[PDB]
Amino acid sequence: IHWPCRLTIGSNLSIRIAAYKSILQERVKKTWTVVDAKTLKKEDIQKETVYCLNDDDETEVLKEDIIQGFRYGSDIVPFSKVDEEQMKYKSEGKCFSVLGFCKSSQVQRRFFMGNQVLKVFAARDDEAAAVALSSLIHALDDLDMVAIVRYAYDKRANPQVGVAFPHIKHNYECLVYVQLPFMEDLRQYMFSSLKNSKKYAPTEAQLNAVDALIDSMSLAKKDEKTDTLEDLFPTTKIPNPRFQRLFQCLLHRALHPREPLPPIQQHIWNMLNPPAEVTTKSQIPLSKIKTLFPLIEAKKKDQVTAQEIF
Amino acid sequence: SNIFEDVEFCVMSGTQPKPDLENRIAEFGGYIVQNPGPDTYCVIAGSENIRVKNIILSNKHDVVKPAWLLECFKTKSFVPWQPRFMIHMCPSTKEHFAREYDC
Amino acid sequence: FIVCLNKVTKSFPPLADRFMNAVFFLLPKFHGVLKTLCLEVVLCRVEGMTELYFQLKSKDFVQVMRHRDDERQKVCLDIIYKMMPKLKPVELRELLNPVVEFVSHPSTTCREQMYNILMWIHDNYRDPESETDNDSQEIFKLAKDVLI
Amino acid sequence: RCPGESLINPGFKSKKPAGGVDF
Amino acid sequence: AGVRCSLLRLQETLSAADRCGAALAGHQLIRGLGQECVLSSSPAVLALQTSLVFSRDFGLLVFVRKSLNSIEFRECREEILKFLCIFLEKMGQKIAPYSVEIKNTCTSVYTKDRAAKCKIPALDLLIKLLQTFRSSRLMDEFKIGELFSKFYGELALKKKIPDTVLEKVYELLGLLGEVHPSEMINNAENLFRAFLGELKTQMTSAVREPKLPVLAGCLKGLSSLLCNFTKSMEEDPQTSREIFNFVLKAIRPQIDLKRYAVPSAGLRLFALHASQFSTCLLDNYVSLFEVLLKWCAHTNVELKKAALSALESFLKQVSNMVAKNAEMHKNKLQYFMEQFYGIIRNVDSNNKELSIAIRGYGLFAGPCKVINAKDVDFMYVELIQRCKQMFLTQTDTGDDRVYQMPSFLQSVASVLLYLDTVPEVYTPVLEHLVVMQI
Amino acid sequence: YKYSGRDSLIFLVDASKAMFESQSEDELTPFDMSIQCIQSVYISKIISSDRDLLAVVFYGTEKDKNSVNFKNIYVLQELDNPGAKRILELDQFKGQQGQKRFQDMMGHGSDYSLSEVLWVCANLFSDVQFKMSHKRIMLFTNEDNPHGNDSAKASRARTKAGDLRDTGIFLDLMHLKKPGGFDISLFYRDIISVHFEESSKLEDLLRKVRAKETRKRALSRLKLKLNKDIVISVGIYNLVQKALKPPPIKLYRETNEPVKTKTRTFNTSTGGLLLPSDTKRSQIYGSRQIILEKEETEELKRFDDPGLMLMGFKPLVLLKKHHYLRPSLFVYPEESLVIGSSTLFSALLIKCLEKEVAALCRYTPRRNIPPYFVALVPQEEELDDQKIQVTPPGFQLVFLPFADDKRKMPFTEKIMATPEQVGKMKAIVEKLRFTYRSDSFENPVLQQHFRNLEALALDLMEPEQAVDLTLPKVEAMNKRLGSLVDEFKELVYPPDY
DNA sequence: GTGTAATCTACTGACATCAGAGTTCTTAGA
DNA sequence: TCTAAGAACTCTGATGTCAGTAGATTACACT
């Protein structure tokens, strides 16, 4: 959806901006409706969310007698929903405004923390914004500097922070915005560090097996002079197997309206595997892993096979 | 006493013994409530708390001096509200008393 | 730790004198059989310690003495019998009130040990050089009255 | 050992005092 | 008797200030009090202790119902309900005047307490309470139908209920249809729909391995439910097929379990209600007697007893099924008359496997006389000639009587039952073998 | 230590008049300092770790409360999970009137004995049932010679505190600005594990710092199936995970009691309390209705069992940083299964870093979840900060989108700026250069929420209202940058806005 | 049978997470 | 001349997960 806003590097200087979500982890449009087993009508069920006090089933009325609480150590404290709104942190506007800039080094790979990615663009038919924002991002293309920005989609929603990371394509400048953690979203643990290898030995023959694995099972093959490899398995171009599988069932149960469900249609595995020539290359380097490394047991667990035929 | 029955109270603060305030009320049978709904008569507080500020911000309720109820207990008879017995009043009471108090 | 320690010290007391702080520190954390194996290391060494009444009163030992569990109550009364000569009349009065409760106890072996306590109290608190203190005199009356 | 480990909440790494933009 | 000085101190632990530490006294105090009065024997002292335990101003059930809001006293509520489960067994129907207030303690504990380890004994105690007072005048004032509406309602949210508590809700619910059918008279069909719909979902689901305790709880409760409210193929042939093929799913060692509660519950259901499954005995017949006989080999003794008791009811029903049917079943009889005879005539195995096969032959005379009277005498004559040598081990002490000749008597009595004529010349032998049992 | 063990912490203040009512200034007070510390670490521990245990004890007071070894000690609070009513018990003793409130009750300046005080605290920790990971005592006394005038009194303490350390209870100290001097080398030298004004440690107990702190725990464990046969066990750990205001517990108005949301499902026509078996699931398409059971809306969406299947290798440059799915999770070995598989994993880590390579995998965190596709990027540790490990070594799971995720975005074309318009920008950008660090910001809502919650909890006077750090400090942006917004307004666009 | 192991399978606290439902805003709009 | 269809965000509720606790079940074993 369109969202109109104003990119603001300092108190006086604002530029018109209108961002679009670009990656979103996508969910199916129609939910599974709930229906009576014999009538097949979607409104013969009413969902009573009834309440109980535990003093022999005194039933409450939510419109008069139920007040939300939070929890504070060994005890409960009552708020009012109507008084959290009196004290709640309220954003002063539907803001977007830069806090400052710093190197690509300040922002490592791991930490990125978002639900979505924005692409954050000069407003439609603003030719002053077009020159100003093309200047902004062309002045980030060369310094390895990145922006850090307060954001908020709309009023009442939570304020937000993070990295507005530039990139370039021949037809437009990229500057994506992504959320970064606050100090309490970040977890620090000293995982026992592995270069102290004296009890978990990486010996010469083990290393000299792996040395061939990771070249041998390459997907990317150098069949090029662009310095771009064949891209033999373009996973971002594959359609989601979750929705292929859903519509495939809705098809089968539509055309055969009382019959049981089919297996996974085989071409979905043939797509979702990475098989062809790479498996013909792999088998020998894998065969020397089986001996140079140990493979001590793991248990198994069962299914409807725990009481199913033959 | 049989007078404060049918009249519901919130003892939102004390500090005079707060937990004994409602116990004195209990031998007068005044209907004790821990958190004032839109049903209640009035709210009683020995001092301010943030919940009392919430009830200054949300005008809907009648907010009462500590000593007034102790006086009604000492009179052995409910004393109706002289102006200082309140420390804030609701819009229903204020529009009632824009007539019958001076402004 | 306690199961292993019980099996050494049952046969050799001196090593317990290192670990007696650990045994007293862990004593309220166990329940069931381990509680007896823990107290039994006290029994292997109770004639050594000083301050043992405060140390033993620090854990709820008078309540530990009332768990109906025949093994525990026997060794528990056996702690009483070995620390017996070193108490002042003040703590013994406190400690004797729950021992005197056992006169109805069903275990013939447990009741015999309690009579061995009471038989010692009579003999050593009969006619002190001063009759004058209520704590020493109450103990003689109360020990006599249950020996009856 | 001591140098990074908070006295309010042991084993966990010391929470540094919030920062922000400051040139 | 120290029971009252003990109960007096229990009420002090409820009112002590260290509510966390006082529970440890209160628990072990009950753990001592419960020893004193299960130990007792004198009828007068025992009577005192019952009405000290069940006291009205004092005593155990008042301590439960007055401590019921605390979370510290769980350990006391478990132990007091475990103790009452013993005391109600010790005393049997002598508990009558207190029995209603035991019920009210169980349902109050069950609703108000969050912990499954308290909900379990509260359910267990209702199982034994309902089960012992079955015949009683009290059984109306239990409010036995309101109780069904109460514990049936828990299923509308069953997903929340922990696995082992959901055994006992079904052990209970099915038993309400055993003990007082008249108040259940319309509810039984919805409870069938519930027991089946759940057990289908639990057995047949492709996404999750079965919750064995919940599956066993269905089969146990169901075995009580079929005792009244019958479902056998003369009427409701579809639901009675469904019940039967779920019993096959349970009974078949389709892959081996490392705990036997599921087959064990399935076998009891089959043994008591094979009369419900009349036709289906003869559909699946080999796989039935193969699997049932496979369970006679098994090393757990209560599983072996559940196995042995299932075969008898199965063969007895199969014998009726052709006591009044035509020649069609010569194929089935040729399987029985061959196969377990091939066991009796060879096997080195235990007297249990042997004697259940001996039993089998005795039943089939009434089937067999329909096709040929001149096999009936020979299936008697030969059994007598076996008895005339099975007594004749010549004082073989400690081995030969141990299970064996009562099965020859039991089976000769049934080839005898079906003969119309009598070989008078074997009356002396027959009676000598009867004397040899005495 | 192991996962479950609680932190447990007991606070043990000198009630002696010579420190208790004492000041060199007027502006603080050592008892008012210690009590502030105890209230403030305790309000930290309430927000951050309600699971961990606190107690507080006064020694040398004149009226007593103990299990045994009674003389001149008062356990104000035994060991318990922390909450409001305990913070209200400490609040009563604070301040100029507070140092009289305490005197009406427990009484001040009497003789005391550390070997008995250390006995008391020992019994306390013993009396509790929970598993404890760290056992710590905090000394709030200034009395640098703790009246060891009798050396045969003092040797009891030193031996008893040997016994504390021997039983693996720890003990810790703070000195409290004794007039003229304090020196640990006189005494306390052997009780703790050159001369001081007041401890540089003590200000850390006034940080008032708030977050949940949740200890190292797995998300799940999985088998990295290299093919049909070779497997290694790996963990899956959550290095970055957005926190939320804690779930609110619905209450009954008239008593504040908690109440059970007790939902049922009821037939619109009739009394049927419909069981889960009574009802199916469904869709509408093409004006017809499709019907499936409550088993199969979750038999659909199955593909695989819990594991990680290897899909071959890529260049790290082709894993484009513009398309990002959900927060990255760590992968680290686990000998809990597949013993010695750490030997393979470690070689795999080491050699990928030489190849400049990622492994690609298909990932299912559970049964009945579809596979996503994930790049295993390899990782290397910056211990250079005196072994403060800013980065653990292992792999990152970085997730990759599929076609459906990459949403269409409208048409636009331009390449508009001149070298002067970039050239002026290259100045402003270099004037606004700072250093971001990951921990440099805090959530304005979630931090404010706790301050509101405390005001309500203690019945404070005011919400603390501590202003957030996400707003740009615009006057500094006016001044550091300076007037250079006019370079856009003059050189780049017309004066009409 | 009777009694003592060893050990599987449960339940709970706690933490993440998909889904599902409540809520404010754009375009197409009589 | 305006009334729903399509977004968007937060919040609530269930399901599955892990670690740790402890009970009851099931083997093991007696000359």
- β-pairing, F372-379 vs F329-333, is unpaired
Q: Which helix (H) or strand (E) holds F140?
A: strand F132-140
Q: Determine the distance from the C-alpha atom of residue E261 to the mean position of all C-alpha atoms in its chain, rounded to a whole number.
A: 12
Which positions in strand G are less than 7 Å from the protein's CB atoms?
Answer: 1, 8-12, 14-21, 24-27
Q: Which CATH number applies to F403-497?
A: 1.10.1600.10
Q: What's chain C's Rg over C-alpha atoms?
A: 16
- Cα–Cα separations (whole angstroms), residue A36 to A42, B11, E205, F230, F291: 7, 50, 20, 48, 10
End-to-end CA distance of chain F: 64
Cα distance between residue F19 and residue F139, in whole Å? 14
F434–A100 C-beta distance less than 8 A? yes
Q: Determine the distance from the C-alpha atom of residue F14 to the mean position of all C-alpha atoms in its chain, rounded to a whole number.
A: 31
F265–E156 C-beta distance less than 8 A? yes
End-to-end CA distance of chain A: 55
Residue F2, CB-side half-sphere exposure with 13 Å CA sphere: 4
Query: F1 and chain D: CB distance < 8 Å anywhere?
Result: yes
Residue-wise DSSP of E171-203 = HHHHHHHHH-GGGGTTTHHHHHHHHHHHHHHHH
DSSP C87: -
Closest CA to C95 of C69, C112, C111, C76: C76
Cα distance between residue F400 and residue F359, in whole Å? 13
SS3 A19: strand
Fold of F214-241+305-402: Ku70; Chain: A; Domain 2 (2.40.290)
Buried/exposed code over A254-270 (b: 16+ C-beta within 10 A; e: otherwise): eeeeeeeeeeeeeebee
- β-pairing, F220-225 vs F307-315, is parallel
Query: F263 and chain E: CB distance < 8 Å anywhere?
Result: yes
- Cα–Cα separations (whole angstroms), residue E350 to B3, E141, E253, F431: 87, 51, 21, 97
Angle between helices E427-437 and E404-418 (to 10 degrees): 140
Closest CA to F33 of F180, F202, F208, F209: F202
Instruction: Write the single-letter amino acid at E333.
Output: L
For residue D10, the distance in angstroms to the closest alpha carbon of chain F comes to: 8
Cα distance between residue F127 and residue C64, in whole Å? 13
Cα distance between residue A185 and residue D13, in whole Å? 14
For residue F441, the distance in angstroms to the closest alpha carbon of chain D comes to: 6
Asked if A144 and F431 count as a contact pair (C-beta separation under 8 A), the reply is: no
- The total of other beta-carbon atoms located within 10 Å of residue E244's CB is 24
Q: Which residues pair with F132 in a beta bridge?
A: F6
Q: Which helix (H) or strand (E) holds F86?
A: helix F84-91
Residue A227, φ and ψ in degrees, nearest 5: 60, 15
Longest dimension (CA), chain F: 97
> Could you identify the residue written with the tokens 């809700």?
E169
Task: Tell me whether residue A200 is exposed, middle or buried, using C-beta atoms within 10 angstroms of its C-beta: 0 to 12, 13 to 18, 19 or more.
Answer: middle
Contacting residues for A42 by C-beta, under 8 A, at least 6 apart: A33, A34, A35, F282
Cα distance between residue A199 and residue E362, in whole Å? 72
With distances taken from each CA to the C1' atom of nucleotide H8, the closest residue turns out to be A1
CATH class of F242-304: few secondary structures
Dihedral, F89, F94, F97, F100 alpha carbons, nearest 10: 70
Instruction: Name chain D contacts of F480, Cβ cutoff 8 Å.
Output: 23
Cα distance between residue E287 and residue E276, in whole Å? 18
Residue B12, φ and ψ in degrees, nearest 5: -65, -20
Asked if E73 and E15 count as a contact pair (C-beta separation under 8 A), the reply is: no
Asked if E107 and E156 count as a contact pair (C-beta separation under 8 A), the reply is: no
Instruction: Name chain D contacts of A148, Cβ cutoff 8 Å.
Output: 21
Task: Give the nearest nucleotide to A187, CA to C1'.
Answer: G15
Instruction: Name chain B contacts of A83, Cβ cutoff 8 Å.
Output: 51, 54, 58
Closest CA to F77 of F139, F135, F136, F10: F10
> Could you identify the residue written with the tokens 């708020």?
A79
Contacting residues for F155 by C-beta, under 8 A, at least 6 apart: none
DSSP A158: P
| CATH code of the domain in which A248 resides | 1.10.1600.10
Instruction: Name chain F contacts of B39, Cβ cutoff 8 Å.
Output: none
Right CATH for E5-438 from 1.25.10.10, 3.40.50.11810, 1.20.1250.20, 3.40.50.1000: 1.25.10.10
Residue-wise DSSP of F302-341 = ----SEEEEEEEEETTTS-TT---S--EEEEE-TTSSTTT
E 26-45 residues with CB below 8 A of C? 28, 31-32, 35, 39
Q: Which residues pair with F13 in a beta bridge?
A: F58, F140
A93, two tokens: 């506007």
Cα distance between residue A128 and residue A14, in whole Å? 11
Fold of F6-213: Rossmann fold (3.40.50)
Instruction: Write the single-letter amino acid at E395.
Output: T
Cα distance between residue A300 and residue F307, in whole Å? 13
End-to-end CA distance of chain E: 49
- The total of other beta-carbon atoms located within 10 Å of residue A306's CB is 15
- β-pairing, F6-14 vs F53-59, is parallel
Cα distance between residue E165 and residue E217, in whole Å? 9
Instruction: Write the single-letter amino acid at E114.
Output: R
Closest CA to F443 of F212, F238, F248, F239: F212
Asked if F450 and F476 count as a contact pair (C-beta separation under 8 A), the reply is: no
Contacting residues for A29 by C-beta, under 8 A, at least 6 apart: none
Asked if F125 and F10 count as a contact pair (C-beta separation under 8 A), the reply is: yes
Contacting residues for E366 by C-beta, under 8 A, at least 6 apart: E319, E323, E414, E417, E418
Catalytic site includes residue F2: yes
A13, two tokens: 């200087």
For residue A270, the distance in angstroms to the closest alpha carbon of chain D comes to: 47
Q: Which chains touch A (3 or more CB pairs under 8 A)?
A: B, D, E, F
Cα distance between residue E420 and residue F196, in whole Å? 117
Instruction: Write the single-letter amino acid at F169.
Output: I
* Nearest residue, CB atoms, C29 vs list F69, F119, F129: F129
Instruction: Name chain F contacts of B34, Cβ cutoff 8 Å.
Output: 253-256
Asked if F119 and F75 count as a contact pair (C-beta separation under 8 A), the reply is: no
Query: E4 and chain C: CB distance < 8 Å anywhere?
Result: no
> Could you identify the residue written with the tokens 């409910």?
B78
Asked if E375 and E386 count as a contact pair (C-beta separation under 8 A), the reply is: no
Closest CA to E71 of F7, F81, F254, F87: F81
Residue F313, φ and ψ in degrees, nearest 5: -120, 155
* Nearest residue, CB atoms, D18 vs list A99, A148, A183: A183
Q: Which residue of F has its CA nearest to B15?
A: F459
Task: Give the nearest nucleotide to F261, CA to C1'.
Answer: H13
> Could you identify the residue written with the tokens 């009574």?
F278
Q: Which residues pair with A166 in a beta bridge?
A: A175
Task: Tell me whether residue E39 is exposed, middle or buried, using C-beta atoms within 10 angstroms of its C-beta: 0 to 12, 13 to 18, 19 or more.
Answer: exposed
SS3 F145: coil
Chains D, F: CB contacts under 8 A, how many? Answer: 64
- Cα–Cα separations (whole angstroms), residue E367 to E283, E342, E381, E410, E415: 18, 19, 18, 17, 11
Closest CA to F480 of E27, D21, A175: D21
Dihedral, C2, C8, C9, C13 alpha carbons, nearest 10: -140
Residue-wise DSSP of F345-391 = HHHHHHHHHHHTEEEEEEEESSTT-PPEEEEEEEE---TTTTT--SS
DSSP A192: P
Buried/exposed code over B12-24 (b: 16+ C-beta within 10 A; e: otherwise): bbbeeebeebbee
SS3 content of chain B, % helix, strand, coil (to 5): 40, 15, 45
Q: Which helix (H) or strand (E) holds F139?
A: strand F132-140
Size (chain F), residues: 497
Cα distance between residue F433 and residue F411, in whole Å? 33
Asked if A210 and F371 count as a contact pair (C-beta separation under 8 A), the reply is: no
Cα distance between residue E112 and residue C38, in whole Å? 38
Dihedral, B1, B2, B7, B11 alpha carbons, nearest 10: 30
Domain boundaries, chain F: 6-213, 214-241+305-402, 242-304, 403-497
Cα distance between residue F161 and residue F170, in whole Å? 9
> Could you identify the residue written with the tokens 């909900």?
E119
What's the reported resolution, in angstroms, to a tenth?
Answer: 4.4
Closest CA to A166 of A124, A123, A116, A107: A107
Cα distance between residue F391 and residue F354, in whole Å? 19
Contacting residues for A244 by C-beta, under 8 A, at least 6 apart: A268
Closest CA to E219 of E156, E159, E280, E264: E264
Query: What are the contacts of F85-93 at 24+ separation with CB within 8 A?
Result: F85/A75, F86/A74, F86/F42, F86/F54, F87/F39, F87/F42, F87/F43, F87/F46, F87/F458, F88/F458, F90/F35, F90/F38, F90/F39, F90/F42, F90/F56, F91/F39, F91/F458, F93/F31, F93/F35
Cα distance between residue E203 and residue A305, in whole Å? 10
- Interface probe for E, chosen from F67, F75, F263, F273 (most Cβ of E below 10 Å), is F273
DSSP B12: E
The whole domain housing A229 covers 204-295+302-309
Closest CA to F268 of F281, F279, F282, F259: F279
Query: C66 and chain E: CB distance < 8 Å anywhere?
Result: yes
Q: In chain A, count H helices and then E strands.
A: 7, 11
F353, two tokens: 């870093």
DSSP A171: T
Query: What are the contacts of E348-357 at 24+ separation with CB within 8 A?
Result: E351/E402, E351/E403, E351/E404, E352/E296, E352/E304, E352/E308, E352/E403, E353/E293, E353/E296, E353/E297, E354/E404, E354/E407, E355/E403, E355/E404, E355/E407, E356/E296, E356/E308, E356/E311, E356/E312
Closest CA to F149 of F194, F192, F112: F112
Instruction: Write the single-letter amino acid at A200.
Output: Y
Cα distance between residue C99 and residue C124, in whole Å? 17
Residue A182, CB-side half-sphere exposure with 13 Å CA sphere: 21
3-state per-residue secondary structure call for E232-284: CCCCCHHHHHHHHHHHHHHHCCCCCCCCCHHHHHHHHHHHHHHHHHCCHHHHC
Size (chain E), residues: 438
E326, two tokens: 């035509």
